[PDB]
Amino acid sequence: RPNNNTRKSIRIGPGQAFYATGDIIGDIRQAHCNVSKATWNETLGKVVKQLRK
């Protein structure tokens, strides 16, 4: 997650402290997942071979 979240603790009564998202630092970037396309194509293939039978 590229977002740089700052911690803002605001008390709501005693001892209790809510941890809100602060103010973001840096340009907003969407979270992502990387999958090796090479590695993925064969794993998906071996399944359809086993599923064949």
């Epitope: 590229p2 340009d27 970037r29 969407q30 992502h32």
Partner: antibody
Framework: VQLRESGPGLVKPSETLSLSCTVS?????????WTWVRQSPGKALEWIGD???????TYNPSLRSRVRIELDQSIPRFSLKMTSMTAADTGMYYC???????????????????????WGQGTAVTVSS | ELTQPPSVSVSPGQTARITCSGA??????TYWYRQKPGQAPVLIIS???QRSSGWSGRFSASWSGTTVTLTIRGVQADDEADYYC???????????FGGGTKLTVLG
Amino acid sequence: VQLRESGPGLVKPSETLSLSCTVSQDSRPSDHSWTWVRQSPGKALEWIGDIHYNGATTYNPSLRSRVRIELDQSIPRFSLKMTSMTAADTGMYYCARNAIRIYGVVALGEWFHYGMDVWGQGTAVTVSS
Amino acid sequence: ELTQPPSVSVSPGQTARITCSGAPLTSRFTYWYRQKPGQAPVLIISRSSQRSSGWSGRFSASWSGTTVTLTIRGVQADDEADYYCQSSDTSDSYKMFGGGTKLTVLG
């Protein structure tokens, strides 16, 4: 860093025209996208087609009938074609680089635009038989 | 398919105002550039990320609602040419140029 236009500069009213723009000393011209523009004799600037090293073409819908832009693969030196409509369109045409500064991940949509930063020497063309 | 004032005149050494009005002013910023007689345009303003764009080259710009503003710096001595507007569409496809201004200094 620098770039200059190239090609013939007159045309009969019919037929097509070919203009090429060579760019050199660029430290990374793959990601950067390129484009052409024009300035009518009545001092009215306009825009023509975006082109990029990926292979994405899209030109002005008011001109799509004629323009067809192509990018050469071996070395940076793209070209612009214009078919039927050519009369009065002439005046002078420029070569500019659509600067693409990227801040995130490509293919997701984090590639906001910087606009024109470096233009060509600026060549002139007129049609008049 | 946008609107730009062709002719505004203002006092030298004073601030000036350039406008460009249109609907797709939500998709891709503004841009302008300046056209000297017989020369190629140059970046008046740029964008490196989010707000840090106009800032301190001089100039500065504001975006109210339908139309945007190019609140230029205080001194306006001799920096005179023709100014246009660039920008893209809501579907990112194509770019429209809608003319622009030619300002002149008095005195």
